[PDB]
Design a protein around this ligand. Structure first.
Ligand code: ICS
Ligand code: CLF
Ligand code: CLF
Ligand SMILES: [Fe+3]
Lengths: 477, 522, 522, 478
């Protein structure tokens, strides 16, 4: 499709909207120009969703509790408010961890204050204090408590900060109040920011005056990798094979202790810029720790990232990096030789949250696949700035796409594969188009690193070339 | 490392020696993990009766609840009407979660919209959000009806749904004649089933309250059927099939069976089937209204009896032999249609399966949880099978329902060792299955975690989970099953007896140790 | 010792210390058992490829066969006709075994009689046995028809069924007009399916051979359906339902569905339903005859084409998507009835389930066995699902069937690693699943023993059994399932994907070891 | 019912038969008279089944392969002939054993020659020799081979004895040819006799000249217990708690070595008289080993049997017997106290093969349950002689009952419970009458001894008092 045809498609799709909705949505759809570096000249992002248009965006509670704080395994996270928010987000995200659940790890459990009408009418601060006492009684091995606010908390005037302070002083426990009420912001992005601020204010500076940790020149932290299907472990094995010491993982399979030890590392390796750039900038400005973005999706991006990371250290790390690359070259070369012929030339459209719509493009291109449309639920304009040079010319870019918009774009473009979330999977499967869940990896993975690339290629081949896609038309119709 | 011929997913890729060593290094260097002996000691403590006493003393903390919030049930009820868009006035994160929950349970598209209420509406309210959302939804997705529920934010700030919708119609955002039924669904009251009840009562009120003058009870020769919060498509199908066999005219109000089972034929159908607006308008003309799940249809019952003047029969959920018999006899009495020979033969075949499997089913102890009507029907059927429902948990149950279930248990010798718990979550149930171990658990997918915990105590302490209820996330297409009627009773019986036999086969598969009882014939 | 409050059956009563000590004393004192190290060494040897080479060199020994003898299938075919008594001329032990086998599979009464041929008849034949047995059976059990098959003793002796029955009618033991169809069913030829074919051909010949003068093909607007040896009641039901939805007139010849599913209502029904004699007499007047399982209905096909002059379509068993589509299109062509929207929606829902479960089903390796048509349909459906049927065993298959299955496998990329074996038993399959391990086994209850053996090698070597086929003895009410059509395809798909998910849940249930992959959502 | 009523019922049931069948069947139905000691004056047994009357009897192959030889675990049993007989009898009988199946134990496996048409036409002796060689190759740890003949073997003129002799001499292996063709005899009883003769001729005398076994005065052999659900183990624990040494078990969980060691024991304890009285009499006449019948069904019969067995030994065995009885008294007394009130006064009709119809009566009576009708598939007149004194007055006795006869008797008598096989279970379950499988114990058990009695009482209560039996009539049909 040429640029003019994509623009005409955008206008035709927007034709159905009322004037206000059409005017707003025209600013969130664009035709990619790779030469453009200031994406605000072509697309607008991080705005309010239009009412009643079936957006895919979540809330600030999802961005804070479900994304940042939830993966931290040795901490207990209280969904403060009614039962629904905690129930729907319980174990829905595959942020993998190692631990004994209910004893020393609590990721897949749902702790909630289960607000009733009386809690709404008279407040829930006393209930929160009693809940903290009961948590301490029944889960003595927890190493900290976070209180993730749901919508009613900020509307009824509850003061969770004072409760957190008093109970933390009384029990000598880290209690982190997070004001992640769902109505705040426009998406999960403000949840990321609020969670980062809570980490900064209540956890990160805990060992500022502690010098007992033995630091090495090769100390790195992994920031913004949430171990989806073990992605962070696949990245960590490569980083440690390179001679580096991964002190912390933020926050997949993460403990509060390594979060507290993060200010001691020599380098910060940020995978998800969108969710953790705030804390990365804070650590750079306070402790002087440099941070760099890296990409471990596909062999090409993985090799480039490994070389860039090793360039931040001495020659021994560079030699170990070359050794790692040489060791893993035959494996991913065999993966390419097996699967690229089955996937060469296939066109894919993506719609994921805030990092992956641009991060997984290199992995698709390593298999000979072309990304023709991409978009974000909640990315900012810096994410689109990074996205311009990764996307092909005259490709489609969408921000906070509506269900109708995505369906019409898919109808016109007709991609061979779609990568999006669970709320689009069955829609596009019923349309006869192979679909890959790009949030949960379709309960597969990991996809990061060389080990993840084999799984990624196998999954793309198994879904794109499945026989079921050739059977949707009845032979008598 | 990966071998291209046999690629490993996370399991068992992370069981490789290099990954094990890296994980051990991470744990020993930076996690500051408690010693394994302390972890084992604390786990053993959590399996004890003292821990159970501490656990049941909880007043403020809820751990692993077995319920959802009202707007989920409101959305499910709204999905049961023809070309109807569920519309949740409030914040969009709620709608994202509702859609994800239903998508994971049904493995189907779930259409629902939000008006995306933000901090701006947290003070002035969401009137403008309501106007713009109604206009945008009608223009874009073209529904014949928009059924409005609320999130907790809108309930807390006190948005007037009626006034907001009337203002939307007055300013021309939506046509005056366009049907916009509404219901307040506060998430801090009741549970998802309460939301289903509120949404159905709102829709029925919207369509019938102001046009009762020309209504005559029994003038259309039909029986209204209100299923309630139902997530088994087979239940809708079996009710419709059984009523069709009897030759009984019926109107299934809120029928989401079609829209939750659309075919994959190359096109996406946002809407499919559902109760028509004409069916809802003509509902007061029915002979009577039958509530399939009366214990969360109390507001609907009040409206139907007080406004439609329908003498709603006091019927339990048609689960199991006796209650299916009572439902069929009451339907026969209301409609005047005799119970046909096909249904009698079906009942006899269910009884035959009961006699065939009674030896394996007898005396088996069960812990079960779920919604009140489903739980009480399961308890009744288990008592009919000679099983022992030792633990009966209903997080969203009330005292009257508990009294009714206690009366049911007292009527059977197999309810002697049964205890009913209301307001207890699955952590309470974990304590119960540790301290007073049953043979099996019946419940939704969350119970899988409990099973894991029991297996951590030992193989002899493991309590296997039988997946009946909502939501089921870790198995495929179980939402197509049936739990109501003779068909549902046969399906449940087959599942129970074969779970027992599978467990026995697993326990006797050890060669030269326990395989003397590995019988070919059971 | 027993505690009255918790009484132990054999398992785990014999795991008590006193019983263990007594068993150890018995073994050490009097059994002269081989040392445990020698037993382990021999087992490990039996799991190897050298043992497989020795095992596949067998020419005379058969170990754990996967087939029965002809009169069993003859009895099953005879049971499908109205008020018909199966009558096996020969020795009574055969009839006792047939009845026990069918009783254990169906959990239903199975009526069948023998004339109790003994050493006296071993020289002079069983003519007197035939006369007395026919008279006694007709007088006592009052059937409208007696369908006569034979045991191996009668076949070896050389009893003339036709002459014996004619003499019985000539001497007044039974009335001349009483229908007594017969078939020679030698157990040393073919298998049970061959017996079904022989019995059906005998009955059809008895009712139609001498009255073909007034028959006109297609004069009753019906289609004859011959199901063959079928032990899933759901298959009969689904064929009848699908033909009824299309509005297609049909005659299901040999329909045992009613008599194998009689209700438990206080009375015993020896006979129920079945194909009527009028239906069989009018069969040549049908438009055409469709054989559901053509690979063991060859004699029936020869009779139907040569005598009824019906152009029997070349159709595979209606198993899975493509073959159900072909069956429906052929039925539409023959009857002139279009395929209705309900069947199209059912096909679309099956395709939707396929798309939902393809990620878990893809690449899974299977060893399967059973009857030729069932095995071929299962292989076809597995190929449609993206699965790999690595081992395909059919003890009663022939070379032409193997060639057809090889052609089916070559048409799919997922049949690359598949091998078809004919004349091999379940010991061969045990060797195959040890040396070339699949993910799962699909077969009857006998495969459970294979699973035990694999578990003895190790948990990582265990091959779980998925019970589809005949006979299923260690589970209850699986005979009510469906394997034909879209409904059967959905049931098989659900069973397969949920077996995979159950195995994955079992493998990832270890706390702090593998439970990182114990996902709530799959 | 009175005696006249039972006689009238018998005549009414027999009314439907043809004259020959009615005349034959009149001799196989009787009204019990406990004072009668010669049962042939009232009932006739062990005769040919009437053709076409749906008998429950099996064949000689079932009585030999399925009953006697099959339970022997370390031996491989070849169903010589077509595939059907071996396939239908594979693992259908719950004769429990301890072993590694396929390596050193082979009970639940089906070994067969799988006769084809060419084997029928030209014989199968060469096929049998090749099969024996293949068995030796693929199962080296087998301690013996038996060849159970099916019907065609005796009709085509195959000589399995010569093949067995030649291959046994060549391989130094015990190969036992059993001529258990199904057409021989009238039921499983001749199968029992043929299997006993094969044991006598080919296995039992193997260690006649061997004196290395160290015998003790308390050596006993359990004969005729087939470990159905572990019944033989439940009996053995009681016998060894009494101070006795159980050298052999015939044949449940039995090995060929203990069969060979049986002629060294001091006493033979015969549970199933019907199936093993032949070998018991042979051992008495040859080795001078006395044999005695015992009953371990129910606490009363178990205590009486234990005392009678201990009376055959010195005073130490009697003291140990009293200790065992005292130890187990509270357990079975608690079982009775729990279950007899739930079962008192219930009436039972039984129809089992050749021993149990009279053996389980004491266990039923220990629970307050009355047996009003009993019968045998294949028992002889000595079994009925033993049955007269166990059955109540004016109770019904049936030999080789037909399906029609049993259904009509059950319709008239209306028992609270029926104990029979798998071929009657679903018939009587559909009639609304609780049914217990008295062959396989309904896949439960054991029922022997005190531990068995607990399970027996629990099973009878669970089936007789199940709620399902109160639901067969639809409420719109009460
Ligand atoms: S945190 Fe973000 S929506 Fe960066 S909220 Fe979301 S586990 Fe997505 S594109 Mo789900 S900004 Fe992570 C994300 Fe990306 S939950 Fe995961 S997949 S890389
Ligand atoms: S936007 Fe986000 S998910 Fe929504 S409420 Fe607000 S924090 Fe929570 Fe919660 S209980 Fe249910 S799901 Fe809501 S209506 Fe309230
Ligand atoms: S009375 Fe007995 S069971 Fe009958 S054959 Fe004879 S030994 Fe055997 Fe065998 S293969 Fe089938 S089941 Fe027979 S017809 Fe022959
Ligand atoms: Fe049955």
């Amino acid at each position: 499709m040429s640029r003019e045809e994509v623009e005409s498609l955008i206008q035709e799709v927007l034709e159905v909207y009322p004037e206000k909705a059409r005017k707003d949505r025209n600013k969130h759809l664009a035709v990619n120009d790779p030469a453009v570096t200031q994406s605000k000249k072509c697309i607008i992002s991080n705005k309010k969703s239009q009412p009643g248009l079936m957006t895919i965006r979540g809330c600030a509670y999802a961005g804070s509790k479900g994304v940042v704080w939830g993966p931290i395994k040795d901490m207990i996270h209280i969904s403060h408010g009614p039962v629904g928010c905690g129930q729907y987000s319980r174990a829905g995200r595959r942020n993998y961890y190692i631990g004994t659940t209910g004893v020393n790890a609590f990721v897949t459990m749902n702790f909630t204050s289960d607000f009733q009408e009386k809690d709404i009418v008279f407040g829930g601060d006393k209930k929160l204090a009693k809940l903290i006492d009961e948590v301490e009684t029944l889960f003595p091995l927890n190493k900290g408590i976070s209180v993730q606010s749901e919508c009613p908390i900020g509307l009824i005037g509850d003061d969770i900060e004072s409760v957190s302070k008093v109970k933390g002083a009384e029990l000598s426990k880290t209690i982190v109040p997070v004001r992640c009420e769902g109505f705040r912001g426009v998406s999960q992005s403000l949840g990321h920011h609020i969670a980062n601020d809570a980490v900064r204010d209540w956890v990160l500076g805990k060992r500022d005056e502690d010098t007992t940790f033995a630091s090495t020149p090769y100390d790195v932290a992994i920031i913004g990798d949430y171990n989806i299907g073990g992605d962070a472990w696949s990245s960590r094995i490569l980083l440690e094979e390179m001679g580096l010491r991964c002190v912390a993982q933020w926050s997949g399979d993460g403990s509060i202790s390594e979060i507290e030890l993060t200010p001691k590392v020599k380098l910060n390796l940020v995978h998800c810029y969108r969710s953790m750039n705030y804390i990365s900038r804070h650590m750079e400005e306070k402790y002087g720790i440099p941070w760099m973005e890296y990409n471990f999706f596909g062999p090409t991006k993985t090799i480039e990232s490994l070389r860039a990371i090793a360039a931040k250290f001495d020659e021994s790390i560079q030699k170990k990096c070359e050794e790692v690359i040489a060791k893993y070259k035959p494996e991913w070369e065999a993966v390419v030789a097996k699967y690229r012929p089955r996937l060469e030339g296939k066109r894919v459209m993506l719609y994921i949250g805030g990092l992956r719509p641009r991060h997984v493009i290199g992995a698709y291109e390593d298999l000979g696949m072309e990304v023709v449309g991409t978009g974000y639920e909640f990315a900012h304009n810096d994410d689109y700035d990074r996205t311009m040079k990764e996307m092909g010319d005259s490709t489609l870019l969408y921000d906070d796409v509506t269900g109708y918009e995505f369906e019409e774009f898919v109808k016109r473009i007709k991609p061979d594969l779609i990568g999006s979330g669970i709320k689009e999977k069955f829609i596009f499967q019923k349309m006869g188009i192979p679909f890959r869940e790009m949030h949960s990896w379709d309960y597969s993975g990991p996809y990061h690193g060389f080990d993840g690339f084999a799984i990624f290629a196998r999954d793309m081949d198994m879904t794109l070339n499945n026989p079921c896609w050739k059977k949707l038309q009845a032979p008598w119709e | 490392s990966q071998q291209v011929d046999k690629i490993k997913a996370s399991y068992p890729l992370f069981l490789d020696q290099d990954y094990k060593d890296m994980l051990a290094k991470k744990r020993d260097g930076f996690e500051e993990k408690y010693p394994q002996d302390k972890i084992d000691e604390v786990f053993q403590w959590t399996t004890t009766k003292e821990y159970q006493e501490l656990n049941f003393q909880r007043e403020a903390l809820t751990v692993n609840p077995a319920k959802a919030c009202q707007p989920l049930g409101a959305v499910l009820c709204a999905l049961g009407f023809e070309k109807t868009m569920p519309y949740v006035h409030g914040s969009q994160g709620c709608v994202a979660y509702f859609r994800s929950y239903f998508n994971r349970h049904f493995r189907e598209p779930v259409s629902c919209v939000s008006d995306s209420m933000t901090e701006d509406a947290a003070v002035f309210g969401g009137q403008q959000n309501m106007k713009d959302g109604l206009q945008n939804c009608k223009a874009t997705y073209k529904p014949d009806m928009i059924a409005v529920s609320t999130t907790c934010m809108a309930e807390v700030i006190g948005d007037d749904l009626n006034a907001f919708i009337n203002n939307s119609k007055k300013e021309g955002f939506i046509p005056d004649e366009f049907p916009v039924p509404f219901a307040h669904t506060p998430s801090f009251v009741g549970s998802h089933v309460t939301g289903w009840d509120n949404m159905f009562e709102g829709i029925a009120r919207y369509f019938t309250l102001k046009s009762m003058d020309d209504k005559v009870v029994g003038s259309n020769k039909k029986i209204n059927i209100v299923p309630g919060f139902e997530t088994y498509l087979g239940n809708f199908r079996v009710i419709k099939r059984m009523l069709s066999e009897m030759g009984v005219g019926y109107s299934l109000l809120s029928d989401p069976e079609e829209v939750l089972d659309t075919p994959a034929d190359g096109q996406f159908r946002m809407y499919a089937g559902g109760t028509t607006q004409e069916e809802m308008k003509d509902a007061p003309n029915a002979l009577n209204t039958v509530l399939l799940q009366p214990w969360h249809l109390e507001k609907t019952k009040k409206f139907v009896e007080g406004t439609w003047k329908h003498e709603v029969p006091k019927l339990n959920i048609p689960m199991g032999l006796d209650w299916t018999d009572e439902f069929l006899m009451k339907v026969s009495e209301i409609s005047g249609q005799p119970i046909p020979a096909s249904l009698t033969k079906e009942r006899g075949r269910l009884v035959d399966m009961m006699t065939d499997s009674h030896t394996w089913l007898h005396g088996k102890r069960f812990a079960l949880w779920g919604d009140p009507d489903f739980v009480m029907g399961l308890v009744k059927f288990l008592l009919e099978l000679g099983c022992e429902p030792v633990h009966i948990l209903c997080h969203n149950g009330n005292k009257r329902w508990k009294k009714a279930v206690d009366a049911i248990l007292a009527a059977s010798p197999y309810g002697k060792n049964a205890t009913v718990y209301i307001g207890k979550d699955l952590w309470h149930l974990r304590s119960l299955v540790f301290t007073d171990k049953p043979d099996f658990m019946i419940g939704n997918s969350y119970g899988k975690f409990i099973q894991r915990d029991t297996l951590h105590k030992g193989k002899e302490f493991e309590v296997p989970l039988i997946r009946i209820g909502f939501p089921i996330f870790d198995r495929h297409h179980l939402h197509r099953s049936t739990t109501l009627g003779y068909e549902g009773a046969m399906q449940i019986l087959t599942t129970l007896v074969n779970s027992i036999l599978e467990r026995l086969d697993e326990e006797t598969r050890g060669m030269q140790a326990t395989d003397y009882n590995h019988d070919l014939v059971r």
